Amino acid sequence: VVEYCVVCGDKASGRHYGAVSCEGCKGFFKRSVRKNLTYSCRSNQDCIINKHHRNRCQFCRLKKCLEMGMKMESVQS
Amino acid sequence: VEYCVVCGDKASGRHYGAVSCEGCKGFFKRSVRKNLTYSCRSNQDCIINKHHRNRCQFCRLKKCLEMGMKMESVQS
DNA sequence: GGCAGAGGTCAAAGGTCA
DNA sequence: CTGACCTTTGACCTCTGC
Ligand SMILES: [Zn+2]
Ligand SMILES: [Zn+2]
Ligand SMILES: [Zn+2]
Ligand SMILES: [Zn+2]
């Protein structure tokens, strides 16, 4: 009955943009895609996305978001 | 129009669990972020008001905590 | 109907920099 | 260090199309 975000391991509201996601992960994906935002990383793209420290590397979040099958094409827009 | 429990200034909004001015919000963030502890030169009951808020950082932080600002809420 | 999976709001967190 | 002011986040909403 409990489902966890494939990005950050937070309680997941459900499948969003093709991925079991927390509400935070959804909204990041949207804004990133809607604003055509690519970010950069300052730690050799090694950044580990955890519920606690997910807002550390926007770049590394979007990497994991796409890695885990969130789909730009699914965000309206 | 609501007033900051720490300094008594006009509050921006509720900040870390208490109706706070931006200043005390800022103070609180940086204090917890840099795990700053503070020393008092006036026996630790320094009056904290808008006009004279920055005399004692120590006494301010005490007030911040006492009036219910929650460190845990401030993030890393 | 019923509900997943899109959308949006705005307080409360964040970061900026004179 | 400070705080006026600006940006992001994510809990909680609604809509609507299978
Ligand atoms: Zn997540
Ligand atoms: Zn990174
Ligand atoms: Zn104040
Ligand atoms: Zn003092």
Say what the resolution is, in angstroms.
3.2
Burial of residue B2 (CB within 10 Å: 0-12, 13-18, 19+) is: exposed
Experimental method: X-ray
Residue nearest D4, CA–C1′ metric: B22
Residues with Cβ within 8 Å of B25's Cβ and at least 6 positions away in sequence, in order, are B12, B15, B16
**Straight-line distance from CA A35 to C1' C4, in Å?**
26
Nearest ligand, measured from the Cα of A42: 2
Which of B75, B36, B12, B15 lies closest to A55 in space, CA to CA? B75
Residue B64 and residue B5 in contact, taking contact as beta carbons nearer than 8 Å: no
Distances (CA, A) of A72 to A16, A29, A32: 11, 8, 9
Q: Give the 3-state secondary structure of residue A16.
A: strand
Domain limits for position A35:
1-77
How many domains is chain A built from? Answer: 1
Q: Which ranges of B18-56 does DSSP label H, i.e. alpha helix?
A: 22-33
**Strand D atom within 7 Å of B53 CB:** yes
Whole-number Å distance, alpha carbon B13 to ligand 2 midpoint, is: 32
Q: Give the 3-state secondary structure of residue A33.
A: helix
Residues listed for chain A = 77
**Strand D atom within 7 Å of B20 CB:** no
Spatial distance between the Cα atoms of A33 and A56, rounded to a whole number of angstroms: 19
